């Protein structure tokens, strides 16, 4: 009911569209201030505008940058510090390129590392620094169901996305006694992964995923940490 996150600052990566955007909007509907990160300044400014149009009085700031670059993440978190410090993090990225294991080159592996693994680590680090200063925080990582089952066509995801989940479990353990929780959600595969049975018989809507992210980010979810929660209509089963 009352998520108790009014006035808190949520940092959301890939926040101009997709699950990042949907997450940002739901948080703003619950009274969160926003800081959005994605590659393109113009599309970011535009996302901020939509949010303000759907949610009267929403405060949204933006930082344009590349998730693949630690220096851009640093710049994001400097702006967060100036806004009072990151209270909530929603980590979202695009998926790596499709391809079977034996057809990928060294460059493909290094690139998936910069996109997926290093980003989860460095965003986590900078978010953790600020949340531990306050003694309260919520991180929600958006992962892939390829954590649970590999797909032959999604080798980069099966492999180089796994560190995302190690970060969730490691930071959950590290930060647990300092009032910060660190959790992950696993949406429908085609929402997180580039491909080129679902018991419920449909792919998820962004809003359905965003509601769970909101709840995990809430005052109410204070005893949940290190959880990796499928939000996929039962497809993980
Ligand atoms: Na806080
Ligand atoms: Na991305």
UniProtKB/TrEMBL annotation:
<protein>
    <submittedName>
        <fullName>Dehydrogenase</fullName>
    </submittedName>
</protein>
<dbReference type="InterPro" id="IPR050259">
    <property type="entry name" value="SDR"/>
</dbReference>
<dbReference type="Pfam" id="PF13561">
    <property type="entry name" value="adh_short_C2"/>
</dbReference>
<dbReference type="InterPro" id="IPR036291">
    <property type="entry name" value="NAD(P)-bd_dom_sf"/>
</dbReference>
<dbReference type="InterPro" id="IPR002347">
    <property type="entry name" value="SDR_fam"/>
</dbReference>
<comment type="similarity">
    <text>Belongs to the short-chain dehydrogenases/reductases (SDR) family.</text>
</comment>
